[PDB]
Amino acid sequence: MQFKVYTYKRESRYRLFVDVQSDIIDTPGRRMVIPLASARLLSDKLSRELYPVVHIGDESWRMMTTDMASVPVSVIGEEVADLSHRENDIKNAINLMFWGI
Amino acid sequence: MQFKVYTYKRESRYRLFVDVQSDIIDTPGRRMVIPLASARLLSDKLSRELYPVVHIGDESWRMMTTDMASVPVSVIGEEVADLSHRENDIKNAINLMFWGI
Ligand SMILES: [Cl-]
Ligand SMILES: [Cl-]
Ligand SMILES: [Cl-]
Ligand SMILES: [Cl-]
């Protein structure tokens, strides 16, 4: 579901992802997602506009916009958070990546 | 380079991709891309709005918008075509996938 955050069932580079696909775009068996990285050991120079900072589990995470990819529903684990309150920053980051605006 | 089409140097599910990242968004060592699939053996019901039809090498291809992903520059092979003349349909497909508009 768009803007919900899930854990991966299989080992991946990151441990959470946010679903960014529209809820009226049907791709059977898959969803387009963006991984979230723990902010703790990342560069302080990472653009906040392209890589928004969000809060889950009492810590900070960066949305790894440029590591967007689709996953099969078989890898979609437990839902751990909802980022719909950060739609503006998420939309801005995605649009920046393609359109530089 | 945005809207240029390249072959993969390593075996992938598809054999061409289009670079869709902005040319002023720098991700060192990587680019965001969308694979192209040969249209020949695909369903005739596949949405043209979400999966545009383009022409390369004297055949038709579908832009596999929902299989968008980043690749390392090490996998970027020869440039085989430029799809900048299809920017309107490419932009429409990408925006549809996230925003349903
Ligand atoms: Cl991490
Ligand atoms: Cl947040
Ligand atoms: Cl193919
Ligand atoms: Cl074309």
Author numbering:
A (entry chain A), B (entry chain A): 1 to 101
Question: What are the paper's exact sentences on this?
Answer:
The primary experimental system utilised is a 101-residue homo-dimeric protein, CcdB (Controller of Cell Death protein B), which is a part of the toxin-antitoxin (CcdB-CcdA) module involved in the maintenance of F-plasmid in Escherichia coli. To understand the structural basis of stabilization, crystal structures of three CcdB suppressor mutants, namely, S12G, V46L and S60E, were solved. On similar lines, in this study, the crystal structures of CcdB mutants reveal that the suppressors S12G, V46L and S60E possess novel hydrogen-bonds with water molecules or adjacent residues, that were absent in the wild type protein and are likely responsible for stabilisation of the native state of the protein by these suppressors.
In the present study, we selected three such suppressor substitutions, Y8D, V46L and S60E with ΔTm˃3°C. The suppressors Y8D, V46L and the suppressor S60E were ~3 kcal/mol and ~4 kcal/mol respectively more stable than the WT. The WT could refold back till 2 M GdnCl, whereas the suppressors Y8D, V46L and suppressor S60E could refold even at 3 and 4 M GdnCl respectively. The average B-factors of the V46L structure are lower than the WT with the most reductions in the loops 8–14 and 39–46.
